[PDB]
Structure formats: C-alpha cells, structure tokens
Design a protein around this ligand. Structure first.
Ligand SMILES: NC(=O)C1CCN(CCc2ccccc2)CC1
Lengths: 412, 412
C-alpha cells in the first residue's frame, strides 16, 4: 500500500511576478510576462525577447556574499524553495529533519556562470576562474544549499530532464513520501538560460519564436501563426507532505497529488511523434497511478510550448486518451503568458494546476486568435473560465522524448 | 509490494579500459589509469594530468555523423549503456518496451561542448553556435538517445547529484523496479569534465592533486601525503531487472541489489563533516533497507577521493556504523587507480562491487604507503585481497552534502 501526498506550501519566481499570488493574478487576468531582454546585447540574434524575472532581490533570501557564489538559476530555486517552506508553516526540528528532503532540478543549469567564467578563461587563463565556479554552477546546489540552510537531512537529489524537470522532480518527490522514504519533500525546478548560449543555442536550432515586433503575441499555443517557443526564467517549488503528517500539525492543504506518470517516446531528440503516442501513454500511466478514469479529468495544464509539432501532438494525445470526454475537459497553456521556463515549466505549471483547483477556474490560452487544423478542443481561448474542477493534470514533454504527467485532486 | 532487483548486465569506459573486463583486469593488477592529459595544453594550469579514456572508438556504437552532435559525456554514457544491454542478453520487443526505462546521469554534463560553443560565441558571434548545442550538451540526453536507439519507452530520466550521481541513479532505478514502475532499467552515469573550465574550476578550489611530476601516485586515498582528488572520465551502466523477470528469461544474474540509502549532511556546500555523520546516516539507512546485520558487510568500495577531509570522514563513518566489525570487513578505494569519475564514480564502483562479489576479491587501494592518523582499518593496501564477500557496499558523497549507499549481495 501507499501513503497519500498533499501540497501544503508553494513558492515561485516567474515572468508574471516575484511570488505565487502575484503570478496567479497575472495568469487569471491573461497578462503576458514577455518583453525584450535588457542589460544584454541581443543584436546579432534573431530572438531579442523572452520571459525575464523583473526586480528579483536575492538579499531577501541570502547575504550579498553568499549570493555572489551562486548562479541565477540557483538563486531562483532557493527563492521559490524558501517561499514554499515559509508558506507551509512547517517547523524543522531534530525530531523530523531526517524525514524532510529536497528535489529541486534544472534543465540547463548554470549557463550564465559558465558564460562569465569562459570570458575569464579565454581572456586571462584558468587562474581567474572563481573558486566557487563548480559548486555555484552545478544543478544539485539548489537541493544542497536549501538542505544546508534549513538543516534538511532527508533524501537530497536533483533531476535534470530538460523541459520535463519540474514535473519529474515533483512526481519522484511524491513517490519518496508515498513509499515512506520521507514525510516532507521540497520539489520543483528553476532555470535562467537567457544568455548568449541559451538564446544562441535554441536560436541556432530555429526553435524560438522570432516575433520581435510583438513579443507579447509571440507565445500562441495551437494558433495557426505560432512559430516556436518563448524562452523564460524563474522557479517553482512545492512542499509535498504525507497527509497524516499535514493533519497532525493543522497544515493548510491546497490539493492532493494522486497520480504521477512517466514515459519515453523513444522517437526523436527534440521533436515529438505527430500523434503524441508517448504523451498519451504517460497520461494513461498517471491516471492508472491515481485509480482514475479519463472521464474524471476536468482541467489539463498543457505543455503547450507554441511549437508547430509539439502543440498538435498534445491535441492528438488528449483525443486518444479521453475519447468522448476530450471536449468536456478544459485544456490551456499558461506558456501563452509565461513563456517556456524549461526545467521550471513543470514546477510553475503544477502550482497553476493546484490554484485552478483552489479557485475553480481554468486559466486562459491567450493569443489563440485562429485555432489550427484539428485544434477544436476547449483550449480556454483568450479569457479565464470559471468551471467545476475536481481533477487537474499537468503535462511536460521534453527533449529526448521524456514525458511526465502529474494528477492533482481537490482535497476536503 | 516491493519486488527484488538483480544485476543482469554491466558496461563501462574507464581510464583502465574500454569495457568492463579490461577495466577489472587493471583493477585487480593494481594498475593506474592516470597520466598527463594529451587532448589539450594545460601548461597554465596547476594540475596537468587525470584519468582519460584511451582509444575510445565511438564508431562501434554510433555513426560518426550522429557522434559529431554529441558531447563526449553522452558518447561515453551511450557506450556503457550499449555494452550493458548487450551483456544482459535482453531483447526489446513490443511486449516489453514500455517496461524498460533508463536513468543515466552526470554531475557536470557537456562542459566541453558548452566551452567550445562559448568560444565560438565570443570570438565569432552567435551564428557559429551549433544547432545541436542544446540536445548535444544537456544531461538527460544519454537517457534520451539510448531510448531512441533501443526503443525503450519506460521511465526516462536523469539525476545530477555531483559526485553521488551514479550511486543515486542506480538506487532510484532499483526503486522504480521494486515498486512496479518498470521491470528493467539501464542505470548509471557518465562524465567528461576534462576541459579548461573543469580542470580550471576544480583547480581554482584547490580541490585537485598537483602531483604533476608523478601522476600515477597522485591518487592516494588515506595516505598521509594526499593532496586532493584526480579528475577522471568515463561511464558505468548496469541493467537492473526484476528478479522473476530475470528468472523467467533465464538471465545470468551477477548479484542482487538489496539496499539503497540516501542522506543529506546539511553541513557545507563542498566540505564533508570530519565525523562522517551524514555518511553514517546514509549507510545505516541502506543496511536497514537491506534487512542486514552490519556484521554481514564483507567489502566496502569507499568513495575514497584522496582529499584530506573526505577520506578521514569515511573512516569515522565506517567505525561509527560497524563498531568492532569495522576491523573485520575490507574497505578499498578504486579511485587509487581510476581517479574520480565524478558523476560516473558511483556507476563504475557499483560494477567493481558486483565484480568483487563475482570473483571473491577485494580490489586494492594502491599508493597507501603511509596510512594517516586513525586510518587503521583493513584498506587493502597495495595488492588485491582474495576473501569471502557475501555483502558489498558502495558509498558516494558529493557537493551539497549529498550521500548515497548501495548494498549488493551474492545471488543463489
Ligand atoms: N576492448 C575493446 O576495445 C572493446 C570495447 C567494447 N567494444 C564495443 C562492443 C559493443 C558495441 C556495440 C554494442 C555493445 C557493445 C568491443 C571492443
């Protein structure tokens, strides 16, 4: 048998806001976080816009000296994690610290730091590389620094599954709790790939929208005029907690995490199969894990990247899984507003899925002006849709054909 | 309820050989894989040697056309994975492809490729960044490319827990199988961090041995004249398989994986605590997971990095976990010969632990001329020791205070 897992704390940096409530207010208002990138010369570049975190103050969390040791993606992960642990009210003690762990991941990790240290290395040789280069750049240092700061002695690890990172991180943390390896996990992801290497790297693969004239219309999932994803920065963290542990301390419980699915497409390094076969197996795995019939799903937070092939595969996968229920559920891409946070996408989208349950509202797919061929589902075009939501899925489908699905349910 | 997990295939690249048997021959002969680095000019660096893979032929696995797109850590992880799958005799079918997954990790991932593309960017502009920059560099693409080449549709993910990565990857892949998420997993790690930023960044932290004039003696775990770790490259992969699934197909079983432990030190970003308290918590977790009396432990493949603080903390943790039995077991560091393969360390050392069980021999700790204060256990100094081994333990410790332990035992 298996223990139940609930969400008792959430934390976020996104292009819409420096916490969950500010971000969620923007999501329900259909506001875009996408703008031309600043203090960084994107002249030789075909994409000059994205989703930046605006006005982040790391000294609310860390001393300036400790912050100087850490890449932005680690700072962002620690901010979301500290927010989530505060939001949970949990008190870490000698009696429970071995039962509290961390799984915060990243898809690309410390590109800004690597870039800045390449500058030193090429211009002056190795003796100018920062002594903190390695520990301040490696993906597991959000989990590492958080564990050291809060005294967490539970399972300590980090996933890196590209654009699926946040989803897998939360799912595998839920497994730790369900199977009794921890009572509490801080789980999610962070990303800051807006450097020459990130915009250049995706740009060289012609993966990005080049809609420089209208950055806020660039992210348009399922719209016939879409032309690739929008690169975005930030972090999401959830406090996952065993149910009896949450009830014993009088925790506020947002939602229950009832299902986790994983699959591999085994198809292509970057492109999904046209029919979304692996995304369909992953959703069916998640529903089987939750003991739920596809008919019980009310809301899907899509991967919805605004790539031609990705968006159409997800429609095919939902029609395949849900059959005569596929039009009854609501499915929206919050990437229409946030852009694509890569490894943090799944983390912030799990939070939006939990808030859809709390507030009984499907967030919009903004910019869905002209649905493409076959995109005839309820994709919540333009404006938020109050409706009944008992069961909410969050999907992530990333490079290497790696898929994740989380199933959340209302808790009462 | 929890299923049993066996090892049916292994694969490797190490500084000692281009497969498992060649690597193991070097281990049992006390041979060093450490030499001055040839693939780049290190005259400006404080460390100029390491454990390189010698004579690797990517072409016996992949087309040279596909290899050109992939960082060496990915090529290395694929090589070990292909070897392990072949060694298992498993045939991928429509009947089983959804039940076979992959978890191959890395501590740093594609630092060579990122460095080379950063050089292109700075010297020539963003239009010279490779279109394959992202999928040829990011850590999850061993799991991704392996799934594409072999048709594996099961759980597809990757860990990144610094020097613990290979141990965590194997342990968590075993849990997938134990809990019914998969019947087979290919799991381990790969690393090729021998680039300017790698040698420069560990050099900046003064973490590396600077014994440039005698590289084969640099790696000297528990020796009083040790002065840091030796950076090494390669990969280890194991095929983990549910017991009844292995028995059902007449698989050759090398050993059973009975125990997995994780803990966080919550102490320091890079330094282990001198008393080895997190390591001790991790080993106790693993021994309890395996249902063992600690006196059953015959052999420990130590982390044994050849750092002053790390090596002594391991002695303290083993004495704390095993009490008087600490004097009866044998403990060695094969990093004495291979150097430190970082995220691959736990993967090649899991293989060495399984081969210790197969051959009933404790591999030597070479270079242990003068054991330091309190380093008075059986550390198998200089020469391989034939002995009874029913139970073998492999430990890993990493940045962020992240600990892993695997417990293997003979299968009858
Ligand atoms: N000692 C050597 O040089 C060995 C190294 C391993 N090779 C490759 C074997 C292989 C190829 C494809 C798939 C699985 C395995 C054979 C030669």
């Amino acid at each position: 048998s298996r223990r139940r897992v609930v969400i008792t704390g959430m934390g976020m940096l996104s292009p819409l806001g420096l916490d969950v409530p500010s971000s969620w207010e923007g999501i329900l208002a259909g506001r875009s976080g996408i703008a031309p990138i600043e203090h960084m010369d994107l002249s030789a570049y075909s994409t000059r816009f994205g989703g930046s975190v605006k006005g982040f103050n790391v000294e609310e969390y860390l001393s300036a000296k400790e912050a100087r040791k850490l890449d932005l993606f680690i700072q962002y992960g620690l901010a979301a994690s500290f927010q989530a642990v505060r939001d949970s009210g949990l008190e870490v003690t000698d009696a429970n610290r071995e039962r509290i762990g961390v799984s915060m991941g990243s898809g690309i990790g410390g590109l800004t730091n690597i870039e800045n240290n390449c500058r030193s290395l090429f211009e002056q040789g190795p003796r100018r590389i920062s002594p903190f280069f390695v520990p301040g750049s490696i993906i597991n240092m959000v989990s590492g620094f958080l564990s050291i700061h809060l005294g967490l002695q539970g399972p300590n690890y980090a996933l890196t599954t590209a654009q699926t990172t946040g989803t897998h991180s939360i799912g595998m943390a839920a497994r730790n709790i369900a199977y009794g390896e921890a009572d509490v996990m801080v789980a999610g992801g962070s990303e800051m790939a807006a450097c020459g290497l990130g915009l250049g790297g995706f740009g060289a693969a012609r993966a990005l929208s080049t809609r420089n004239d209208e950055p806020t219309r660039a992210s348009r999932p399922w719209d016939r005029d879409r032309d690739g994803f929008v690169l975005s920065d930030g972090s999401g963290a959830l406090v996952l907690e065993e149910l009896e542990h949450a009830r014993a301390r009088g925790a506020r419980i947002y939602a229950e995490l009832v299902g986790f699915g994983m699959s591999g497409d085994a198809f292509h390094m970057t492109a999904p199969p046209e029919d979304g076969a692996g995304a369909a197996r992953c959703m069916k795995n998640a529903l089987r894990d939750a003991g739920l019939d596809p008919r019980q799903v009310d809301y899907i937070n899509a991967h919805g990247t605004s790539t031609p092939a990705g968006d159409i595969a997800e429609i095919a996968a939902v029609k395949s899984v849900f059959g005569e229920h596929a039009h009854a559920l609501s499915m929206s891409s919050t990437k229409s507003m946030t852009g694509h946070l890569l490894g943090a996408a799944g983390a912030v989208e799990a939070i939006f899925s939990v808030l859809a349950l709390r507030d009984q509202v499907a967030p919009p797919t903004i910019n869905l002006d002209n649905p493409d061929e076959g995109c005839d589902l309820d994709l919540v075009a333009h404006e938020a849709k109050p409706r009944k939501i008992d069961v909410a899925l969050s999907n992530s489908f990333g490079f290497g054909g790696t898929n994740g699905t989380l199933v959340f349910r209302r808790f009462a």
